[PDB]
Amino acid sequence: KYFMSSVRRMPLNRAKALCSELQGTVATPRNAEENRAIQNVAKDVAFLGITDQRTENVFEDLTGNRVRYTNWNEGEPNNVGSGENCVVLLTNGKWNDVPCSDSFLVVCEFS
Amino acid sequence: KYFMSSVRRMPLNRAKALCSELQGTVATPRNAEENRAIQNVAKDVAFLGITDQRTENVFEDLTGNRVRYTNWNEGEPNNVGSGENCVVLLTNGKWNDVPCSDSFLVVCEFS
Ligand SMILES: OC[C@H]1O[C@H](O)[C@@H](O)[C@@H](O)[C@@H]1O
Ligand SMILES: OC[C@H]1O[C@H](O)[C@@H](O)[C@@H](O)[C@@H]1O
Ligand SMILES: [Ca+2]
Ligand SMILES: [Ca+2]
Ligand SMILES: [Ca+2]
Ligand SMILES: [Ca+2]
C-alpha cells in the first residue's frame, strides 16, 4: 500500500476523481500504522476515503465496506451544521467529520 | 520507484500537471527493468518524461537532465512534420517521438 498527498485543496468529489485518475482511491486507514503513514504524507488536513452518506453515523469506505478501525478526535463525529458526511485526518492524526462540499487536501492510496 | 497509469488521455503539459498534483513526475525509465515496469502498467500508448524541446535530437528528462538509456522503436526518433519533441512508450515497449500537443495516457512515477 502506497500513499501520496495532493498539493492543492478540493472537495471530496474532485478528490475521488483525482485518486481514481491514477487508478487508486482516497486513503482509508485500516489501523494505527496506516493512519500514521497517511498523516506523515499529508502536510495539512486531508480527506480520507470514509463517509456516512448512505446511512448517518454508519461510516464506510468508498466501496461500501463499514470501517472497523477509527481514530476520532474527541467530540467527533458530531455531524454539525446542516450535516457532515465526509471525513478528514487532522494534522494530529485524529479524525473529524466535515461537509463533503468543503475543500481539503487529499491522500490517495495505491497498491 | 512506483509507477501508475492514468485512465484518460491528455497532452504532455496536462500529464505533467496530473503527476505533479500528487507530487510525482512523468515516468522516465533509466534502464530496461524500469521500462518493462512501465509497460506492466500502461495498457495503451503512454507519455514518458522525456523531450528534446531544448535542442532537437538531444533528449532530456523533464528536469533538463540528458538521458542515457533509450529504447527507440525502429525508425525513431524521426521528428515528423512540424515536429515531434515529446516521447511515448508504444505497446511493444519501444519508444516513439510525438507532438507534445497530442494526447496519450500518462504513466506517473513516485518514489
Ligand atoms: O469544534 C469542532 C468542530 O469544528 C468545526 O465546526 C468543524 O471542523 C466541525 O467538523 C468540528 O466538529
Ligand atoms: O510510422 C511512424 C510514424 O507514425 C506516425 O506518423 C507518428 O506516430 C510518428 O510519430 C511515427 O514516427
Ligand atoms: Ca454525517
Ligand atoms: Ca465534525
Ligand atoms: Ca524533436
Ligand atoms: Ca515519431
CA of A51 to the centre of ligand 3 (A): 7
Give the total residue count for chain A.
Answer: 111
Residue in chain B closest to A10 (alpha carbons) equals: B21
Give contacts of B6 with chain A, Cβ < 8 Å. 21-23
What cell was used for B72? 527507440
User: CA-to-CA distance for B95 and B92, rounded, in angstroms?
Assistant: 9
Cα(A76) to centroid(ligand 1), Å: 8
In the CATH hierarchy, which top-level class contains the domain B1-111?
A: alpha beta
- In B23-76, alpha helices (H): 32-41
- Closest residue by Cα to atom 1, ligand 2, is B75
| Calpha distance B89→B34 (Å, rounded) | 12
Does residue A47 contact residue A26 with C-beta atoms inside 8 Å? yes
Contact (CB, 8 A) for B71 and B50: no
Kindly state whether A42 is in contact with chain B, defined as any CB-CB distance less than 8 angstroms: no
Quick one: which of A6, A23, A5, A21 has its CA closest to A110? A23
Q: Where are the beta strands (DSSP E) in chain A?
A: 2-5, 25-26, 46-51, 60-61, 86-89, 95-98, 105-110
Q: Is the dihedral of CA A37, A58, A45, A8 positive or negative?
A: positive
- Lining ligand 2 with CB less than 6 A are B 76, 78, 80, 84, 96, 98
A98 lines ligand 1 (CB under 6 A): yes
Query: The cell 461537509 sits on which residue?
Result: A99
Q: Is A74 within 8 Å of chain B by CB?
A: no
CB contact (8 A) between residue A22 and residue B2: no
Q: Which residue of B4, B8, B21 is in closest CB contact with A24?
A: B4
Rounded CA separation A97/A95 (Å): 7
From CA A77, how far away is CA A57, in angstroms rounded?
A: 8
Establish whether residue A51 lines the binding site of ligand 1, counting it when its CB lies within 6 angstroms of any ligand atom: no
Give the closest residue (by CA) to ligand 1 atom 6: A80
Method: X-ray
Dihedral angle over CA of B54, B58, B63, B67, nearest 10: 180
Q: How far apart are CA A43 and CA A53, in angstroms?
A: 26
Q: What are phi and psi of B25, to 5 degrees?
A: -135, 170
**Cα end-to-end span (Å), chain A:** 5
Residue labelled with grid coordinates 533528449: B59
Measured between beta carbons, the chain B residues lying within 8 angstroms of A7 are 20-21, 23
Q: Where are the domains of chain B?
A: 1-111
Q: Are B38 and B107 in contact (CB under 8 A)?
A: yes
Cis amide prior to B29 (ω within 30 degrees): no
